[PDB]
Write a protein that binds this ligand. Structure first.
Ligand SMILES: O=c1cc(O)ccn1Cc1ccc(Cl)cc1
Length: 133
């Protein structure tokens, strides 16, 4: 039952500072424009120890499967090749991406009936709110 509160199909309902987060990460202009327009759904499922997070939008579809605490290689929507580790720390999914000596962290947390995603690069934080589909 690891992560039951996260499992299901979620749809983006609001975003703040995501363009600025992408700038901080190094995402180029045309990718930022199209990625920032997206209204993705996030589909989270668990099978045994394997968690799968799929993100579907008109921009890109991504899918990652992983075991908590076990590093994996990820190709992000913006085409960075990163080394990622996802852990569950005090009920929060914490997703760290490492590439080119840089690091960014994406946190996913349940708050009321929402799933709140906080993306942090250096001093820039973006908050994205998802609701059940
Ligand atoms: O998967 C997600 C979902 C979000 O709501 C926010 C960030 N990311 C990762 C992401 C990173 C870069 C780009 Cl361009 C798009 C999405």
């Amino acid at each position: 039952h690891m992560c039951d509160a996260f499992v299901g199909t979620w749809k983006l309902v609001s975003s703040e500072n995501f363009d600025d987060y992408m700038k901080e990460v190094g995402v180029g202009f045309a990718t930022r424009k199209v990625a920032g327009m997206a209204k993705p759904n996030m589909i989270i499922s668990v099978n045994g120890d394997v968690i799968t997070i799929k993100s579907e939008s008109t921009f890109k579809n991504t899918e990652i499967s992983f075991i908590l605490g076990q590093e994996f290689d990820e190709v992000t929507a913006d085409d960075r090749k990163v080394k990622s580790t996802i852990t569950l720390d005090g009920g929060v999914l914490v997703h760290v991406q490492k590439w080119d000596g840089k690091s960014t962290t994406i946190k996913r947390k349940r708050e009321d009936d929402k799933l709140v995603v906080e993306c942090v690069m250096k001093g820039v934080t973006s908050t994205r709110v998802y609701e059940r589909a």
